[PDB]
Design an enzyme around this catalytic site. Structure first.
Site, PDB file in Angstrom:
ATOM      1  N   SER A 117       1.439   8.921   4.941  1.00 26.88           N
ATOM      2  CA  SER A 117       0.818   8.931   3.622  1.00 26.88           C
ATOM      3  C   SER A 117       1.831   9.476   2.630  1.00 26.88           C
ATOM      4  CB  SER A 117      -0.456   9.777   3.618  1.00 26.88           C
ATOM      5  OG  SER A 117      -0.923   9.991   2.300  1.00 26.88           O
ATOM      6  N   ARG A 118       2.156   8.686   1.605  1.00 28.58           N
ATOM      7  CA  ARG A 118       3.155   9.117   0.636  1.00 28.58           C
ATOM      8  C   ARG A 118       2.607  10.067  -0.415  1.00 28.58           C
ATOM      9  NH1 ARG A 118       6.187   4.353   0.417  1.00 28.58           N
ATOM     10  NH2 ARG A 118       4.244   3.178   0.141  1.00 28.58           N
ATOM     11  N   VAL A 119       1.287  10.163  -0.566  1.00 28.14           N
ATOM     12  CA  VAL A 119       0.738  11.201  -1.430  1.00 28.14           C
ATOM     13  C   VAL A 119       0.951  12.572  -0.802  1.00 28.14           C
ATOM     14  CG1 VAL A 119      -1.347  12.060  -2.521  1.00 28.14           C
ATOM     15  CG2 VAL A 119      -0.883   9.623  -2.489  1.00 28.14           C
ATOM     16  N   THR A 168       0.815  -1.211   0.000  1.00 28.53           N
ATOM     17  CA  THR A 168       0.000   0.000   0.000  1.00 28.53           C
ATOM     18  C   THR A 168       0.854   1.268   0.000  1.00 28.53           C
ATOM     19  OG1 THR A 168      -0.194  -0.220   2.398  1.00 28.53           O
ATOM     20  CG2 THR A 168      -2.009  -1.041   1.055  1.00 28.53           C
ATOM     21  N   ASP A 169       0.195   2.395  -0.286  1.00 24.58           N
ATOM     22  CA  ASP A 169       0.845   3.699  -0.346  1.00 24.58           C
ATOM     23  C   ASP A 169       0.951   4.391   1.006  1.00 24.58           C
ATOM     24  OD1 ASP A 169       0.855   3.324  -3.141  1.00 24.58           O
ATOM     25  OD2 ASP A 169      -1.094   4.305  -3.328  1.00 24.58           O
TER      26      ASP A 169
END
Ligand SMILES: Nc1ncnc2c1ncn2[C@@H]1O[C@H](COP(=O)(O)OP(=O)(O)OP(=O)(O)O)[C@@H](O)[C@H]1O
Ligand SMILES: Nc1ncnc2c1ncn2[C@@H]1O[C@H](COP(=O)(O)OP(=O)(O)OP(=O)(O)O)[C@@H](O)[C@H]1O
Ligand SMILES: [Mg+2]
Ligand SMILES: [Mg+2]
Lengths: 478, 470, 55, 240, 354, 240
Positions: free
Chosen positions: A341-343, A315-316
């Protein structure tokens, strides 16, 4: 005799072995003599291993089994909105037929590298902690992980309810749960009005293992129909751990070689196949998107177990919930330090981005100084401002059940916190301050709320300060 | 005769029967191309790799894609060679999968292009270089405190928001500009969203024309995720051997390579090793790493991102991986927040090349003095926070004064950051780096403001920046 | 006044030593924990495979 | 037993109480025969079909439109490991859960219920009432805070705590002792007859303890009593 | 005719199964059709289990296998001095063939109880810390143990270099190391002139597991050739942990049941059989000696692990090199607390001990 | 070897000393063989017949009416794990055990015998004598109390201990050091000659230490001496 028919040799534990069926395909559906469906998974030299999608008590050795010539597929359409259904597309709510005119295969390729687009649109969950510190964008894969009874289902239900006035279609997939629990969840969704845009897919604990194995694929297949039409879909998988356990049971019954914790070698491939089908599409094929929220239940907080490591790798981003935080009174119980959260800011509006950095800095500074709280009682030094700010931040991040907050109101309360307007309110009054502030906003700050809603940016600083002070001179400290 | 037929399908594992006396060799590639004969069939385009000879003229293979729709008895073609991928100038600026097929939409490579086998033995003993040579990267912190070795392996450690991609792009740019060498990026276990983002970032930066990209995505089978690293390495070896260049190879995460190996071993049914890993863990790691070496006519140097399971450096996968490393680069979120954009931790990063035998006595002494000063500054942090700057002794104040300037001078303006900052990048030779740090340590610039050291190249730019400010 | 200064210095030194000892103990305990974790995983996987190929 | 109860649930619409002595033995017997049946072992030596076999039994024990079955099941936890697959799988089938710890049993507290791990779907403000909900949450918060203090107490002593932490310890000890009770069926073990406590009474007693009405009472007077007035009577007998 | 010729039945992961070979001996060399050598491991009723001593890619089902008539052997002699060879004795330095005329078995019995003598001659390593605190005698077996990047290779190279003016043949055995590091080590030895009396045996990390298995035994056989002729030999095994890992891989590929840390039962026998061949011969046997310096790499300095304890229970003492002491600037980082030489002191010269 | 010893025990009525260099290697070789014989492996890869083989070897080593055999056997503990099956199963065959510890060996204490784990059937008042038994039990009690404090000393030292515990540590360190001894055989490792200490002298010395006679002597004077008078002599030789 023909290559399209076979005879059963062995029956037991929900799988059967058949002689013949020379032209059967891998993953094909087969039909038994009494009408129960099956799925061909093992093609061996002289026999076929079949997993049974129904009651196997009626099947005996020597019974005829026939080809269907089709790969597994499920009905898809807008007629599934508001219905609760099983992984085969058969309704279980007792409300009549489904009236669907289209089908889509269970297994499908994921969108390619060049078919995608960078995530740039916020998915508003309505939870202050998530929307401020671990943002989720449309097309993102975000993992919700924690022990039992920590609030994972509550987070998902609040997120689904918050999508009322947004162009989002929700799909809730229940895997291995009690039918009574699923009934209660559906009742809460109906009470809050979420069934106008929600599909529920259920595979309870009494169902055969292949149904639990196939349920998330059915959910994502139903979602892809809307995604490729240009719409935005949210999918929640409630127990990927239970889905993995069902697949392990099937693999062991088919005598495939075991690995760590007796899982088969392709258990990572299974979940990667599932979770790579969530994507944000490029403009060349509509801006449709599918965002996924898988769930993983840990045992005694051990995130180093095999399935948790697999899903964390895939997952991201991750959201961690902890029971000690839960019992301390931290109500959503989200560990903001561990969660990531990588976004990042790409999934936030400007108004939220302009205050989230200060919020995160204050929270981190508080967490670093938490051990000094006892020695501040005699006022040893001037860092106690950081302790007070952190206490007020922790009070602000708390939230009640089934009450999501609009993003403009979240932005305004976080602005008030980070600009120092709560520095003279006692920490015991912050919750009531926030509630009364929301009421005051609904009464008088409609211009500020409309400005945020229209421009996605903060209003004028002077106007915000004037409104906050006007409310503050009317608030009464308990 | 090269025709076989499928006899067993069990997930990603396929058994094929060949005519007696015509078995394919181990690691050979097999092709299945089938057209639907009727309405009860589907089209097949699949590749298999030979793994074992089971006897009775049967071969056990691992599939490079999904096996859904396979039927027992369909025809299998033996290609007579391992997987072969195109090599040369044609691969620059393109994105490939494990099979060497272009994943972008730019068109396919003509069939007459040269293709090299993926599996090959490592270079022989007498073909290796006899002496160690430094690779100059042009980055001040890397060249001073953790020098790179031509043909060496460097472990890269860090999180997500610490600029790993920017560092990779800057390395590619600097090597292409100053040494004339290309780079190859091998995305072992790459997420599709992050791969798309990386492709767009490289295209924006302009380093795309000097690099070849290979992606093995997470939703692909373990065999493909296992062989992506080897296909990237094969792509780099052509430029090492034929063109005599010095080439950079990037591996997205080598732990995923080991995990894919473990999954393939479990599928094939071999007994697990110590912590559930495959019995052949060390052998597979060696067969990968021993081909990244320096020869008499060129070299391949590798930057590898490493994931440590459960933060246990004693775990067998990190333990085997570290047995081949020559250097270590650590990225620090604290430095990133402070504004040190290279973000390399100056104290945690280590290198076996930092020894006076190969780097030079002056270089060694300057590096040790810098590290000692930064360690002392690290120690003084708590007392500075408690009592303030004024309570420190005079020599502690001098140490802080030198240390802040050194810390700022470890930053650098990158070429790939120009598109955002507007400032041109710089390439700093190691001699200039050593001289500048020696001058800072000697107190030649104690009177300059600390902001003059922020983001510059050579030491003269600090003086120019201070003069420009005032 | 001299005694008060001595007391504060003594507390500072004693707590510094206690913190250092605790850090060393944490390091050794973490090493032992990781060894136990690896040994466990080995034991379950070996038992699983022995039972599987006993059939 | 389940089919005997299902007859009364369906054919007569009766309310049924179903007590199961130990439901773990069902899983244990399945695991005993799995290898002889010829199935490959699963993670901790259990059968591969553990979850399916458990579900096919548990899903039958339920209330319907025609009648209601309220069931109490005792679940064994092997080697006190709550992460064991059998109890871990059983957890998802229950609405209310009671966790017993030999850490409390060793200390002389009975029925030795873990006050934090125990959960129920009925603990909501709209079901039990706002006052009950607030009292329960405050008790849990106090006990959770007390749990963290023990590690530093065992090292640095009680004197180094702040006045707030000292009060937290003082009240948490009394709360933990007051959660004990003397049962009717445990006369052979306790030597005294049991007690029955209404929910209103226990809520009021815990509220008073939280408010500090009984800070001066010795903490041993709170053991195995019942109502709050019995604590006062016990302390008076002890001579306070 | 299946007496001297066989046919391959199964191939995989470096092991093969052959039909025929009726007269093959246990432990015999066999040759495949493409020239790769193998060793006959198991003689079952209908088939022969063969371990492949080379690249197994070119070996296919139906290929021909033939006997060599010789028990597993390596060439020995003075012509092997100054060369770099693989565990089979094939040169890898590119300087042409090797002109040896005689061979020795790779598996040989150790000297008996009455064939030995007490260690009484010093072996000068030239390192002050070792020669003072932990002396080494000729015929002793001394373990060198420590984490990676601690200087074990440097200690071995210094010891080999110091033997220039002393009657001592040196054999350096590298198991599982990098070919680049082996090349650099050979270059340093050449520069300092140690190749006039040194033999190098190499089996890098890319080689198949059986070669890493066999390398120490080839080294010890080459040393035994000189030892039984009256000379003094020094043998260095650069990692026995890599050899243990390779043997574990082979055993698991043969589906033998594993034990502690997945190692097989005879992992102790593997090392004891090898290290028992180092000895100080008596006057009747000729007075030759062979000295062994095995290396073991620990994880986080854990001396209590399985392989470290096994090796400690075999050798005559150990030198423990400490990582944090190494980082502190004391590069010969001897931990005097844990280091000990059991049969030292007796070999130390009188001037040094007093 | 056992067959050679049994002849002297039986046919001649002799008293026999039987020394076995390492009895663990016997079971280790059995486990090496058992895999190739075709047997299914036991818990830690050992042979399934580990206990019966050990019993059949050990039951022959016994004293009878015709003659007596006393045997001293060294037993290897793999990876210092005392719960390993091979060391664990041999405990039931022994009348007296001495357990050596690497922790004691590293602190310079030799022969590094663990004083609490080592046991013997002969430690009884009617066998060794009343005062011998009392002295041994009191020494073991002080050592147990010292062991219980090790975490507190490890974290924060002796400064926060009570006065009783300070005296316990003061006595226990000296007792632990006085349990060391210089061996005749160890004269090759160090020039110090060995000593032979009668049991009466041992009892008297430990009684005197327990009574507090030598509290003023430095603790380093108790290392590797033998009789109690040598402690005084070497304390005088050093600074005192
Ligand atoms: N923010 C909140 N405020 C108050 N109560 C909450 C909150 N979040 C969760 N709860 C309550 O805590 C309990 C946790 O239930 P929930 O279903 O959310 O947990 P879960 O982690 O999904 O657990 P399960 O293992 O039972 O599926 C429920 O009683 C729920 O009502
Ligand atoms: N006495 C010494 N003085 C200075 N430098 C030294 C000394 N001993 C070793 N070194 C250096 O320290 C490093 C240790 O590497 P070395 O190969 O000797 O250790 P190792 O334990 O064999 O390593 P590995 O297992 O990684 O091969 C090398 O760079 C070496 O040059
Ligand atoms: Mg839930
Ligand atoms: Mg080395």
């Amino acid at each position: 005799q023909v290559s399209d028919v076979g005879t059963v040799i062995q029956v037991g534990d929900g799988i059967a072995r058949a002689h013949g069926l020379d032209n059967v395909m891998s993953g094909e559906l087969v039909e038994f003599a009494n009408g129960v469906m099956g799925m061909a998974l093992n093609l061996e030299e002289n026999n076929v291993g079949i997993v049974i999608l129904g009651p196997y008590t009626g099947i005996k050795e020597g019974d005829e089994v026939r080809r269907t010539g089709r790969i597994m597929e499920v009905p898809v359409g807008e007629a599934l909105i508001g219905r609760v259904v099983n992984p085969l597309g058969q309704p279980v709510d007792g409300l009549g037929p489904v009236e669907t005119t289209e089908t889509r295969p269970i297994e499908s390729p994921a969108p390619g590298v060049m078919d995608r687009r960078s995530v740039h649109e916020p998915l508003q969950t309505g939870i202050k902690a998530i929307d401020a510190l671990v943002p989720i964008g449309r097309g993102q894969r975000e993992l919700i992980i924690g022990d039992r009874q920590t609030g994972k289902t509550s987070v998902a239900i609040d997120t689904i309810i918050n999508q009322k006035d947004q162009n989002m279609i929700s799909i809730y997939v229940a895997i291995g749960q009690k039918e009574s629990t699923v009934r209660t969840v559906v009742e809460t969704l109906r009470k809050h009005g979420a069934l106008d845009y929600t599909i529920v897919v259920t595979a309870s604990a009494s169902q055969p293992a292949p149904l639990l194995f196939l349920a998330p694929y059915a959910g994502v297949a139903m979602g892809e129909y809307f995604m490729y039409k240009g719409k935005h879909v949210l999918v929640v998988y409630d127990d990927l751990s239970k889905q993995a356990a069902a697949y392990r049971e099937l693999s062991l019954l088919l005598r495939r070689p075991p690995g760590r914790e007796a899982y088969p070698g392709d258990i990572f491939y299974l979940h990667s196949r599932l979770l790579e089908r969530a994507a944000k599409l490029s403009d060349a094929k509509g801006g449709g998107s599918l965002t996924a929220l898988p769930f993983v239940e840990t045992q005694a907080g051990d995130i180093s177990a095999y399935i948790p490591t697999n899903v964390i790798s895939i997952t991201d981003g991750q959201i961690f919930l902890q029971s000690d935080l839960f019992f301390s009174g931290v109500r959503p119980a989200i560990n903001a330090g561990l969660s990531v959260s990588r976004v990042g800011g790409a999934a936030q509006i400007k108004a939220m981005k302009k205050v989230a950095g200060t919020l995160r800095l204050d929270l981190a500074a508080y967490r670093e100084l938490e051990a000094f709280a006892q020695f501040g009682s005699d006022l040893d030094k001037a860092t106690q401002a950081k302790l007070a700010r952190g206490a007020r931040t922790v009070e602000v991040l708390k939230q009640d059940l089934h009450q999501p907050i609009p993003v403009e109101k979240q932005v305004l309360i976080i602005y008030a916190l980070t600009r120092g307007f709560l520095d003279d309110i006692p920490v015991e009054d912050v919750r009531r301050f926030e509630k009364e502030f929301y009421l005051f906003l609904d009464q008088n700050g409609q211009h500020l709320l409309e400005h945020i809603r229209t421009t996605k940016d903060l209003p004028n600083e002077d106007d915000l300060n004037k409104a906050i002070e006007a409310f503050k001179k009317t608030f009464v400290v308990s | 005769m090269t025709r076989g037929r499928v006899i067993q399908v069990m997930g990603p594992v396929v058994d094929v029967k060949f005519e007696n006396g015509h078995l394919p060799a181990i690691y050979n590639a097999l092709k299945i191309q089938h057209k639907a004969r009727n309405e009860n069939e589907v089209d097949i385009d699949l590749t298999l790799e030979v793994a074992l000879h089971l006897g009775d003229d049967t071969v056990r293979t691992i599939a490079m894609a999904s096996t859904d729709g396979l039927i027992r008895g369909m025809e299998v073609i033996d290609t007579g060679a391992p997987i072969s991928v195109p090599v040369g100038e044609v691969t620059l600026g393109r994105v490939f999968n494990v099979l060497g097929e272009p994943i972008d939409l730019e068109g396919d490579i003509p069939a007459d292009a040269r293709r090299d086998p993926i599996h090959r033995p490592a270079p022989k003993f007498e073909e290796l270089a006899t002496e160690v040579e430094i690779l100059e990267t042009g980055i001040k912190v890397v060249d001073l405190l953790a020098p790179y070795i031509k043909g060496g392996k460097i472990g890269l450690f860090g999180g997500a928001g610490v600029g790993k991609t920017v560092l990779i792009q800057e390395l590619i740019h600097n090597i292409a500009q100053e040494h004339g060498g290309i780079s190859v990026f091998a995305g072992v276990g790459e997420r599709t969203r992050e791969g798309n983002d990386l492709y767009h970032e490289m295209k924006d930066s302009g380093v795309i024309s000097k690099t070849a990209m290979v992606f093995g995505q997470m939703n692909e089978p373990p065999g493909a995720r296992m062989r992506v690293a080897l296909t990237g390495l094969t792509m780099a070896e052509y430029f090492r051997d034929e063109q005599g260049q010095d080439v950079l190879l990037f591996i997205d995460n080598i732990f995923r390579f080991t995990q894919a190996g473990s999954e393939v071993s479990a599928l094939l049914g071999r007994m697990p090793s110590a912590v559930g890993y495959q019995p052949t863990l060390a052998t597979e790691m060696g067969q990968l790493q021993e081909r990244i070496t320096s020869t008499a006519k060129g070299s391949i140097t590798s930057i590898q991102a490493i994931y440590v399971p459960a933060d246990d450096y004693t775990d067998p996968a990190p333990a085997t991986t570290f047995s081949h490393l020559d250097a270590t680069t650590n990225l620090e979120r604290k430095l990133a927040e402070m504004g040190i954009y290279p973000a390399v931790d100056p104290l945690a990063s280590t290198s076996r090349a930092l020894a006076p035998e190969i780097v030079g006595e002056e270089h060694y002494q300057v590096a040790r003095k810098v590290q000692q000063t930064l360690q002392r500054y690290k120690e003084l942090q708590d007392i500075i926070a408690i009592l303030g700057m004024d309570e420190l002794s005079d020599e502690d104040k001098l140490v802080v004064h030198r240390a802040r300037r050194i810390q700022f001078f470890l930053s650098q303006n990158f070429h790939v950051a120009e598109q955002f900052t507007g400032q041109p990048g710089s390439y700093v030779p190691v001699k200039e780096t050593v001289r500048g740090f020696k001058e800072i340590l000697e107190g030649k610039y104690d009177h300059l403001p600390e902001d003059a050291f922020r983001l510059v190249g050579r030491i003269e730019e600090v003086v120019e920046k201070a003069k420009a400010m005032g | 006044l001299d005694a008060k200064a001595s007391e504060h210095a003594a507390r500072m030194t004693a707590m510094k030593n206690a913190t250092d000892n605790a850090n060393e103990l944490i390091r050794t305990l973490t090493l032992s924990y990781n060894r136990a974790r690896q040994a466990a995983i080995t034991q379950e996987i070996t038992e699983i495979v022995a039972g599987a190929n006993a059939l | 037993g389940l089919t005997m109860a299902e007859y009364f649930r369906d054919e007569q619409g009766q309310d049924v109480l179903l007590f199961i002595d130990n439901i773990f033995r069902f899983t244990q017997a399945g695991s005993e025969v799995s290898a002889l049946l010829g199935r490959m072992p699963s993670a901790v030596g259990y059968q591969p079909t553990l979850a399916t076999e458990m579900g096919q039994l548990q899903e039958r024990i339920t209330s319907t439109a025609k009648g209601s079955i309220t069931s109490i099941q005792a679940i064994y936890v092997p080697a006190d490991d709550y992460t064991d697959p059998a109890p871990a799988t059983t957890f998802s089938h229950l609405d209310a859960t009671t966790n017993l710890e030999r850490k409390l049993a060793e200390m002389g507290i009975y029925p030795a219920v873990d006050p934090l791990a125990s959960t129920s779907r009925a603990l909501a403000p709209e079901i039990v009432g706002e006052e009950h909900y607030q009292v329960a949450r405050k008790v849990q918060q106090t006990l959770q805070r007390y749990k963290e203090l023990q590690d530093i107490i065992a090292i640095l002593g009680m004197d180094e705590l702040s006045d707030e932490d000292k009060l937290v310890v003082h009240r948490a000890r009394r709360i933990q002792f007051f959660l004990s009770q003397n049962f009717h069926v445990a006369e052979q073990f306790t030597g005294q007859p049991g007690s029955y406590v209404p929910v209103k009474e226990t809520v009021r007693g815990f509220k008073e303890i939280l408010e500090g009405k009984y800070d001066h009472l010795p903490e041993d007077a709170f053991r195995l009593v019942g109502r709050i007035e019995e604590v006062v009577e016990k302390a008076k007998a002890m001579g306070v």
